[PDB]
Amino acid sequence: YKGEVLGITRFGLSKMRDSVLQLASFEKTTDHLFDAAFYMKKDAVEGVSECIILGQTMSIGTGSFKVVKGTNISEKDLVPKRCLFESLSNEAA
């Protein structure tokens, strides 16, 4: 899907994965994160490898959606209150 045959080796994942900590658990050496600091890359926390590194929920499976508790207002008592000084001050000015 990047236009060429990449392969699942170290150069192919670098074309696929623009992130640092996902490729960091791949590698066996350490200078992949020094040029992350040099060229000052800024990756997101979207992939499920760095979701569990940083300890926040991945967005596949049960994290794929969001659950919402619906409120039972139905615009009933969300009419605003009186504030009849503005009825006074309308006659003032």
Binding site: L33, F34, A36, A37, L54, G55, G61, T62
Partner: protein, 99 residues
């Protein structure tokens, strides 16, 4: 800890993590890896992205925009080993809730 002749600890490592991702079970993976292995209430700073002590940031002397988060302690141990190698992992945060 490690070993059997300690109290114990059974390693859940790198291959069963793969298994529960494939089930999509995301809160088990959050619980079995972080909540019940090494959970750590940490104080990040919002303008710097570094971790402060006691609700107080050090690189900007203010307790003002300090956020309190739970994190794996190995990720805390990672960041303070990166700051010693002179790279700076600055956490960029945001709110969870739409407005």
């Amino acid at each position: 800890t490690e070993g059997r002749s300690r109290d114990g600890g059974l390693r859940l490592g790198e291959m069963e993590r793969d298994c529960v991702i494939a089930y999509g079970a995301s809160q088990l993976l959050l619980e079995r890896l972080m909540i019940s292995s090494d959970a750590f209430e940490v104080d990040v700073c919002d303008k710097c992205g570094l971790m402060g002590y006691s609700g107080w940031c050090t690189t900007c002397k203010s307790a003002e925009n300090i956020i309190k988060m739970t994190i794996p302690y190995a990720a805390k141990l990672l960041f303070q080993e990166l700051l010693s190698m002179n790279i700076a992992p600055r956490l960029r945060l945001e709110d969870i809730f739409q407005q």
